[PDB]
Design an enzyme around this catalytic site. Structure first.
Site, PDB file in Angstrom:
ATOM      1  CG  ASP A   1     -30.834 -10.461  30.156  1.00 39.41           C
ATOM      2  OD1 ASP A   1     -29.785 -10.080  29.596  1.00 39.41           O
ATOM      3  OD2 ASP A   1     -31.856  -9.749  30.244  1.00 39.41           O
ATOM      4  CB  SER A   2     -29.714 -17.587  30.110  1.00 34.06           C
ATOM      5  OG  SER A   2     -30.888 -17.475  29.339  1.00 34.06           O
TER       6      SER A   2
END
Ligand code: MG
Ligand code: ZN
Ligand code: ZN
Lengths: 69, 46, 56, 19, 32, 147, 266, 56, 391, 115, 233, 140
Positions: K188-189
């Site tokens: 999710d970065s």
């Protein structure tokens, strides 16, 4: 709230095309795509800068100035 | 602000199932707008 | 339960985590401000008199 | 294929052209 | 358009929706 | 976060010359991972990006209302009429070396929201600090230099 | 001459479209990166606000003023402020502009970048003037004033590169392509039914012969004949972007040589 | 047949085969009595409890 | 922090930004994402605590979990996808990129391996360069279905003396699985060598995926026209079977299964038909997907997604369930006011025939919303009760 | 708050040199050169030019972390060929090629009259 | 909507016709001289009706007017939709997209999403940054976050036209590549462009207001707003 | 150094599989009726069609001199003479399996970076092959 000076993605100066963009819409009766292409914004990164901009400074200018000279 | 002004709350000690999205909730409360926490299904938005 | 079995402690830090493929498996990337806040008391020895003097 | 554009300025112009 | 009694489409109902929000607004229940 | 439940923090920031670029010189403002797509089944993120690409190229804001008769194939036809690949892929180049990536990259505008969770409002450390009056343990809360 | 070859396809005031041939991929990409990030340019760096009764924040206005493209033709004559012996800034390392705007009209007065006035001694150089591109003669729309609002401020513009901040970048978007027919097979084309039909041909495909679809894959062929399009923000002319990029890359390599000789002599 | 057990015998066999370069064509130096007695004394060397009484 | 691997000892690397940085492989024991997750640091203040922190709580020492006697740290996400793409038979690497890969391995001994292809062009395979990260003396052998000593599908795994012989490296090899490469290396070479293996594999695969690229898009969710026609025919024939069972039940010609009523047997038959319809349509869509499909590549690598995600995005979302049954008659004898009374058709009681690509009808949208709400409620209740049970 | 200054991408700090050459013990006649305040722009160019040198057996560069503007360049040459001289020759050939490119672009631009 | 017998056409039809739609648009464009035709005009003429959940049990509602009302080749890209095979409708939905609330109406193509993702976005849309009110300069709120450059979405819903989302937006149109570029966007970065950040992408204003009062505890115990000195304080 | 095995094979069939650059060929020897080869070939570098006569050679080294990999590979210098100059497609790999198909027939398995071959025949011509590294030189 006011038009950004430069395109976020590439850095093309789009802040000087905002006042001529409004003229192409209101008195030349162009649709938005032809008005964007006429100003030289051929990359959609530049086109989203003018096309999606909201001119919230016009709403901020309706309030009376707090420090009036 | 708009979502907060149309927010509803259901106080929860009964044997029903107040947290599930009911059939009768069609067009009256939002099918997917609820907190993920302990207020899931109990806090509803019109 | 709130004060004996578990308690708030010193020498601890908390921030958001982010991924780093260039770190080792047993490495944590610690922020410089967190590093400057958290401390370790190192006892002065002949082996580290010069380094601890420089750190002071 | 329906046009996937919310074009409401031109429909306002058309409706004012009817008026 | 030309026919006053012609049936509406799914596009026209948005006009109806606009009329709703031209009268009620989004906080009509609190004010009412 | 996007408008589809696709939240996440900034892992790193790259300058423009390090970002991948298309043949038109366009670099992304944002690179998100493919692995966030299939398990979450967020198809509407992809359709929103495709429709936003067509919208920016054509100058008409995209109709993304739920239960309309707008299909992916119509947006793809409109995108192909603008001279781009119909499914939103673009031949991108590696910014470090200039070589073409072997895989083409899904590319286009997407609406993203800045959430109120900053790292600077959440970073916290304490070597020693004030103690509570009662238990003489570290206090609670980063605003009070807590533990 | 022997070496990299340049054939300019199109030339404009703010666009040059050229074919860079007989050159490696690394040097073309390094030239692209240097033009993007390494050319020294003049941009407003510090803003000292005297009066701000606008609806915009001081820091908002300062960020907008940093992105104003300023003339940087004679930027090599200017010195870096870190390399100057003055206390904060002077004529040797900075250009001082001023901006005084007042809403004396009933309608909204637009504050443009043409209202920036150089108050420092330029010493005959060709720097500091805000770049005007549109036909109306105004610059970038900086601010808007209603009646009675005032904006008085002083900008100090210092030289810098886009690695420090993107306001110092004169390179806009640089189009960069090679091998439009994928004869080197550097891309494996994603497709649904046919890769040739579903992927539109680029405009540069006219400048190379299409593959004969029976010939074997040329494993010995390397990437050359790059199609590049440099766009200028306006700070320097678009030809000076390419020339100054070549000069900056040459200076970086020469600095590496100089450091190598300095530690060779020790 | 497959059950969780401590020592992976197969990996040790493969490591011995690749370490000493078993060509599986040359006849082996092992005598059968040596194999049987070695397995037996290995079984006597697998110590979990070191007590010296009948229960342990 | 449910388990002991959720609190482990790391080594500090001081970095110039405001976030904790950590390896990607260590996120699985921590159950950590980067959507805003925060993690606590704790600094020992004495040599005893500092020492027993690094001799008991160190991350390499916790690679193999005592919970399931298998590794709990593995190659994940982009590294897993790129390690599947790197070890395909088609993946050949030219000399400059090979040298850059070899230098990226920190404990590389400085010898360039002889290429798998010498003439007419020196080409190294991806297996050959990934074998540099694998330490010598490591032997692994796994046979998948249809795997022989010749591997026509390149499945299975054969590693001899730390050199990959055949097999695409996937979740079964470098994932957190028993008998994998991580388990074998940490049992034969020790925990420190296994941590170095994690770093080396991540560095070389991340470099290759950086200079190769990997994406996913809307076109990866699209099956072609004949496959969509076949999926529509499958759904239509399942609806025909459901209609036939409904006519048999409404004529009272349907016999009751033992231990359940007529309505329960009818519901079981209908749910079985709709579930096998969704499975068949998804299998058709998955078979239609090419090897260049990115969702297929992620599923084949095991990095993210599964068959059901491909089925729902491309073929059919399927029957929506609340409390294990179909959508109940929340109104009087109907599920929604847009259906007539006593409608037991699949569209009435919550079968979503459309995929996420084609978009849900409003009734299907509402039924899917009920299913998602039930899932969220069950998730919250399960988390609270399992925290209670764990304490 | 923890953000480093941007001039640390291109300015040599106090007590920091531009280059730092170490012998490499893994292979004979090989060095590792640490370039400070540079990035892929210089590294890729230098490496790809060193691979055109015939007496260079190995040339590679890596940026170990994107936070720090530095890269390591490993050069291994043949016996009797100093890798420092290989770096000098690669740099000189880059200088000459860039000078030829500058002259060619200037002449071709002067041919253009539509600017 | 109200569905009547409509014996002129021989089948059930909505009572609202194109003339009422034209009158509504004429009133709407007057608002931006003929008779004012409003929502209450539709209500008083029996064109629309108010139905609660109890009355919803005794009615049959058509989803769309042009599909389910008139008596009955297809595009394979379009979703599969049934016509219910029944013509005894009493009402019609005005639009199905009005089952959503305020937060879910911001979501583009919510019918192409998994429902938990729509719930998560309806939660996180309240945490976004935009311009909450145009008079934030004269409001001393405790905390206020204002984006420098809000942009209306390129992909927008009809419903947010009534939510004033194109007038007070809460985000920016970022050029987004879905790519495994450097391994720094895993789990999710995301990798943001630093050059875009330098030009104002997602740069925001933050305001914090501090309140303080001088309270009179009694005669001599009173507080004073003053600059203290180290000598006497 | 010297040739461990050399024979002329006729390609019976070429299976591309699910690959775009690698095709698995199955070929039978012309001189011997029961020696045959199954081999993965990078067909962009070396295109192989059906019924193609390939001279297939296995060597232990490429240099013309006798043997005296642990040595670092280096790019070939100008004027370097090797066995590879006499062939069109040279691969390097490891023998990883020696199996006995029957009382006479043995099969040797080689892995050139994951490109596999199985070469089988009886032992009067395959006895030079042992558990080591080898070059596979193919010419047309
Ligand atoms: Mg998380
Ligand atoms: Zn742009
Ligand atoms: Zn000065």
């Amino acid at each position: 709230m006011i038009v950004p000076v430069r395109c976020f993605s590439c850095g093309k100066v789009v802040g000087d095309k905002w006042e001529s963009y409004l003229n192409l819409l209101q008195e030349d009766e162009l649709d938005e795509g032809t008005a964007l292409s006429r100003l030289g914004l051929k990359r959609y990164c530049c086109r989203r800068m003018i096309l999606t901009h909201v001119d919230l400074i016009e709403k901020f200018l309706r309030y009376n100035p707090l420090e009036k000279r | 602000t708009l979502s907060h002004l149309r927010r509803t709350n259901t106080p929860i000690g009964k044997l029903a199932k107040p947290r599930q999205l009911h059939n009768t909730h069609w067009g009256l409360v939002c099918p997917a707008e609820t907190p993920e926490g302990q207020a899931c299904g109990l806090v509803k938005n019109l | 339960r709130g004060n004996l079995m578990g308690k708030r402690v010193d020498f601890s830090a908390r921030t958001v985590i982010s991924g780093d493929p260039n770190l080792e498996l047993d490495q944590v990337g610690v922020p410089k401000s967190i590093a400057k806040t958290l401390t370790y008391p190192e006892v002065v020895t002949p082996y580290n008199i010069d380094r601890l003097t420089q750190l002071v | 294929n329906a046009s996937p554009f919310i074009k409401r300025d031109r429909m306002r112009r058309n409706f004012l052209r009817m008026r | 358009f030309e026919d006053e009694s012609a049936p509406i489409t799914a596009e026209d109902s948005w006009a109806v929706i606009s009329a709703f929000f031209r009268e009620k607004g989004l906080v009509s229940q609190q004010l009412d | 976060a996007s408008r589809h439940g696709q939240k996440g923090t900034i892992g790193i920031t790259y300058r423009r010359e390090d970002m991948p670029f298309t043949a038109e010189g366009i670099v992304p403002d944002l690179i998100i991972n493919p692995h966030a797509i299939p398990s979450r089944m967020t198809v509407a993120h992809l359709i929103e990006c495709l429709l936003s690409k067509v919208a920016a190229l054509s100058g008409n804001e995209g109709d993304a209302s739920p239960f309309t008769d707008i299909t992916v194939e119509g947006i793809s036809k409109l995108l192909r009429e603008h001279g781009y690949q119909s499914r939103g892929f673009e031949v991108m180049y590696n910014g470090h070396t200039g070589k073409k990536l072997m895989a083409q990259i899904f590319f286009g505008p997407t609406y993203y929201q800045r959430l109120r969770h900053m790292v600077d409002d959440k970073i916290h450390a304490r070597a020693r600090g004030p103690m509570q009056v009662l238990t003489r343990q570290p206090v609670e809360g980063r605003s009070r230099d807590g533990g | 001459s022997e070496g990299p070859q340049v054939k300019i396809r199109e030339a404009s005031k703010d666009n040059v479209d050229f074919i860079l041939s007989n050159v490696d991929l690394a040097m073309a990409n390094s030239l692209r990166r240097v033009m993007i990030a390494e050319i020294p340019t003049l941009a407003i760096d510090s803003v000292e606000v005297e009066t701000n009764t606008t609806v915009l924040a001081d820091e908002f206005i300062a960020h907008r003023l940093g992105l104003i493209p300023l003339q940087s033709m004679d930027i090599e004559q200017l010195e870096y402020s870190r390399d100057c012996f003055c206390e904060d800034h002077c004529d040797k390392c900075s250009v001082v502009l001023t901006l005084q705007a007042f809403g004396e009209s009933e309608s909204t007065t637009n504050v443009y970048s043409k209202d920036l006035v150089i108050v420092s001694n330029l010493m005959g150089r060709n720097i500091g003037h805000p770049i005007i591109q549109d036909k109306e003669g105004n610059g970038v729309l900086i601010c808007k004033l209603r009646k009675g609002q005032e904006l008085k401020l002083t900008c100090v513009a210092k030289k810098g590169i886009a690695k420090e901040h993107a306001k110092w970048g004169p390179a806009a978007a640089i189009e960069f392509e090679y091998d439009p027919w994928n004869k080197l097979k550097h891309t494996d084309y994603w497709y649904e039914q046919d890769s040739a039909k579903e992927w539109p041909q680029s405009k540069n495909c006219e400048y190379e012969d299409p593959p004969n679809e029976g010939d074997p894959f040329d494993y010995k062929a390397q990437a050359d004949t790059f199609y590049m399009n440099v766009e200028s923000v306006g700070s320097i002319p678009v030809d000076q972007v390419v020339v100054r990029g070549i000069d900056t890359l040459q200076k970086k390599v020469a600095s590496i040589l100089l450091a190598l000789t300095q530690m060779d002599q020790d | 047949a497959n059950w969780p057990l401590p020592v992976n015998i197969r990996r040790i066999i493969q490591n011995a085969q690749q370490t000493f370069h078993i060509d599986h064509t040359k006849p082996s130096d092992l005598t059968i009595k040596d194999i049987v007695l070695g397995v037996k004394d290995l079984q006597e060397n697998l110590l979990v409890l070191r007590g010296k009484n009948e229960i342990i | 922090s449910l388990h002991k691997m959720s609190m482990m000892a790391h080594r500090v690397k001081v970095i110039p930004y405001s976030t904790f940085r950590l390896n990607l492989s260590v996120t699985s024991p921590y159950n950590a994402d980067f959507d805003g997750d925060e993690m606590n640091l704790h600094v020992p203040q004495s040599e005893e605590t500092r020492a027993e922190l690094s001799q008991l709580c160190a991350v390499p020492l916790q690679i193999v979990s005592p919970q399931s006697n298998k590794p709990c740290m593995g190659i994940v996400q982009d590294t897993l996808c790129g390690i599947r793409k790197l070890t395909l038979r088609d993946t050949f690497i030219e000399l400059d990129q090979v040298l850059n890969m070899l230098y990226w391995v920190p404990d590389w001994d400085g010898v360039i391996p002889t290429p798998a292809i010498i003439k007419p062009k020196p080409l190294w395979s991806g297996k050959q360069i990934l074998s540099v990260a694998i330490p010598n003396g490591i032997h692994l052998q796994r046979f998948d279905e249809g795997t022989t000593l010749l591997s026509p599908k390149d499945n299975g795994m054969l590693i001899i003396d730390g050199q990959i012989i055949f097999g695409v490296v996937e979740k079964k090899t470098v994932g957190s699985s028993n008998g994998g490469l991580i388990h074998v290396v940490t049992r034969e070479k020790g925990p420190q060598v296994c941590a170095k293996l994690f770093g080396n594999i991540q560095k070389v695969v991340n470099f290759w995926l950086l200079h190769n690229g990997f994406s996913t898009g809307i076109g990866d969710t699209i099956a072609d026209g004949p496959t969509m026609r076949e999926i529509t025919e499958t759904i239509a024939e399942a609806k025909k079977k459901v209609l036939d069972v409904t006519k048999e039940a409404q004529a009272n010609l349907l016999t009751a299964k033992h231990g359940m009523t007529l309505r329960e047997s009818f519901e079981d038959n209908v749910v079985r038909f709709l579930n096998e319809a969704r499975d068949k349509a998804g299998r058709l869509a998955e078979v239609n997907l090419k090897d260049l499909n990115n969702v297929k590549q992620m599923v084949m690598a095991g990095s993210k997604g599964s068959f059901i995600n491909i089925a729902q995005m491309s073929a059919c979302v399927g029957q929506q369930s609340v409390e294990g049954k179909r959508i109940a008659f929340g109104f009087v004898d109907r599920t929604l006011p847009h259906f007539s009374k006593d409608d037991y058709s699949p569209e009435s009681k919550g079968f979503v025939e459309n995929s996420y690509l084609r978009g849900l009808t409003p009734q299907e949208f509402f039924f899917h919303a009920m299913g998602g709400r039930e899932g969220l409620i069950d998730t919250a209740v399960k988390t609270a009760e399992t925290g209670y049970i764990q304490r | 708050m923890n953000a480093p200054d941007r001039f640390e991408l291109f300015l040599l700090g106090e007590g920091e040199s531009k280059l730092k050459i170490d012998p490499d013990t893994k292979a004979p006649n090989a060095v590792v050169i640490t370039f400070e305040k540079e990035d892929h722009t210089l590294g890729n160019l230098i490496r790809a030019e060193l691979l055109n040198d015939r007496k260079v057996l190995f040339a590679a560069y890596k940026v170990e972390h994107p936070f720090f503007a530095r890269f390591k360049l490993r050069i291994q040459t043949t016996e009797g060929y100093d890798p420092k001289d290989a770096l000098k020759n690669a740099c000189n050939s880059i200088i000459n090629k860039l000078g030829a490119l500058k002259t060619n672009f200037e002449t071709e631009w002067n041919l253009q009259t539509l600017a | 909507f109200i569905v009547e017998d409509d014996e002129s056409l021989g089948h059930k039809e909505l009572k609202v016709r194109k003339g009422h739609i034209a009158k509504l648009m004429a009133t709407e464009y007057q608002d931006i001289d003929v008779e004012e035709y409003t929502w209450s005009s539709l209500l008083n003429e029996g064109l629309v009706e108010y139905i609660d959940a109890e009355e919803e049990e005794s009615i049959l509602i058509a989803m769309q007017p042009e599909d389910l009302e008139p008596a009955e080749d297809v595009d394979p890209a379009k979703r599969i939709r049934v016509s219910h095979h029944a013509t005894t409708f009493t009402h019609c939905e005005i639009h199905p997209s009005m089952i959503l609330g305020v937060a879910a109406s911001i979501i583009p193509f919510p019918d192409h999403n998994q429902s938990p993702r729509n719930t998560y976005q309806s939660a996180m849309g309240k945490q976004a940054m935009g311009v909450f009110l145009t008079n934030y300069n004269v409001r001393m709120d405790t905390m206020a976050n204002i984006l420098y450059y809000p942009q209306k979405p390129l992909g927008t819903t009809r419903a947010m036209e009534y939510l004033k989302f194109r007038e007070l937006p809460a985000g920016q149109n970022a050029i987004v590549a879905i790519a495994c570029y450097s391994g720094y966007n895993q789990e999710d970065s995301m990798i943001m462009n630093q050059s875009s950040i330098d030009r104002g992408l997602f740069r925001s204003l933050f305001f914090r207001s501090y309140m303080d009062q001088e309270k009179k505890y009694g005669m001599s115990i009173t507080e004073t707003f003053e600059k203290p000195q180290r000598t006497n304080t | 150094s010297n040739t461990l095995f050399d024979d002329i094979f006729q390609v019976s069939e070429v299976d591309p599989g699910r690959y775009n650059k690698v095709c698995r060929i199955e070929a039978a020897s012309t001189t011997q009726d029961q020696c045959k080869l199954t081999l993965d070939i990078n067909v962009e570098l070396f295109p192989v069609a059906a019924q193609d006569s390939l001279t297939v050679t296995i060597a232990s080294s490429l240099n013309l001199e006798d043997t005296p990999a642990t040595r670092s590979w280096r790019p070939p210098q100008a004027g370097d003479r090797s066995l590879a100059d006499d062939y069109d497609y040279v691969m390097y790999g490891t023998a990883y399996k020696f199996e006995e198909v029957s009382k006479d027939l043995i099969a040797v398995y080689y892995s050139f970076g994951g490109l596999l071959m199985r070469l089988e025949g009886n032992y009067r011509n395959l006895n030079n092959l042992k558990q080591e590294n080898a070059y596979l030189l193919i010419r047309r």
